[PDB]
Amino acid sequence: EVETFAFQAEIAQLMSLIINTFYSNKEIFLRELISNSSDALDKIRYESLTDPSKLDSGKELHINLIPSKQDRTLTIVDTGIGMTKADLINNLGTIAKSGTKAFMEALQAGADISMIGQFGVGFYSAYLVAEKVTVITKHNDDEQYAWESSAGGSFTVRTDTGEPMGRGTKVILHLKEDQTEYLEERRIKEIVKKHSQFIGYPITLFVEK
Ligand SMILES: COc1c(C)cnc(Cn2cc(Cc3ccccc3)c3c(Cl)nc(N)nc32)c1C
């Protein structure tokens, strides 16, 4: 049961800009995804202060970075709050619309693509390095879903039947052929140290077998 949805025009336009503009500082994508994971961990942590049963789906709050040369993927996993089906279909796009317009309005005013996270739409920087992004997510009181898009103006949502996650989000970046440097341990360590050194949750960089 795979449902296909159209992005709103403004988000499709942003995704095309990210894919089409010449911009060499592509490494910013990782800081943006780690920042989103940190925000999601903050949210479940806060909610658990008034309802401790929200951690029944997992007490550990952490971020894992997992490279796979065999699959040509870099995966960012967190045990944060996760996303509901309504988030995937509607709420993400609703929240992003204003920031996308504002980001587009900073760019021609002279701003740089690296400021994308200040407009709340840093996730889409994943398309600087990925030809396709698959997102597996599980929110308390909702099912585990898989969202996917190769930026054709459309994305898909389906119920996920893979390894149950407990709670959180996995962003799976299917890297472009010429962006495999982001599978290298030395490269990922360099990027995390430079842009993500003061995140308040443990970040584990897995090593490839
Ligand atoms: C589907 O993939 C996307 C798309 C399409 C856009 N943005 C994000 C970034 N994003 C947004 C949320 C929660 C959120 C929901 C609704 C409205 C605003 C925020 C979120 C959480 Cl909880 N964790 C992580 N790791 N990333 C997140 C993702 C992953």
Q: Cβ(88) to ligand 1 under 6 A?
A: yes
Q: How far is the CA of 183 from the centre of ligand 1 (A)?
A: 23
- Contact present, 63 and 77 (Cβ < 8 Å): yes
For a mutational test of ligand 1's pocket, the pick from 92, 97, 133, 157, i.e. the residue with the most ligand atoms closer than 8 A to its C-beta, is 92
Q: How far apart are alpha carbons 195 and 188 in whole angstroms?
A: 11
Q: How far is the CA of 83 from the centre of ligand 1 (A)?
A: 7
Which residues lie across from 169 on neighbouring strands? 78, 137
Q: How far apart are alpha carbons 192 and 3 in whole angstroms?
A: 35
For the chain, counts of helices (H) and of strands (E)? 5, 8
**Domain membership of residue 86 as a residue range:** 1-209
Q: How far is the CA of 101 from the centre of ligand 1 (A)?
A: 18
Number of domains the chain contains: 1
Q: Cβ(81) to ligand 1 under 6 A?
A: yes
In the DSSP assignment, the letter for residue 135 is E
Q: How far apart are alpha carbons 195 and 33 in whole angstroms?
A: 11
**Closest CA relative to residue 83, chosen from 131, 6, 38, 141:** 141
Q: How far apart are alpha carbons 36 and 201 in whole angstroms?
A: 12
Q: What sign does the dihedral 81-61-149-126 (CA atoms) show?
A: positive
Strand 168-175 relative to strand 2-6: parallel, antiparallel, unpaired? unpaired
Q: Position of tokens 């796979």?
A: 68
For a mutational test of ligand 1's pocket, the pick from 83, 100, 203, i.e. the residue with the most ligand atoms closer than 8 A to its C-beta, is 83
The DSSP string of 76-134 is EEE-S----HHIIIIIHHHHHHHHHHHHHHHHTTT--GGGGGGGT-GGGGGGGTEEEEE
The DSSP string of 60-79 is ---EEEEEETTTTEEEEEE-
Which CATH number fits the domain that encloses residue 146? 3.30.565.10
In the DSSP assignment, the letter for residue 54 is G
The residue whose CA has the least distance to atom 19 of ligand 1 is 92
Q: How far apart are alpha carbons 207 and 186 in whole angstroms?
A: 10
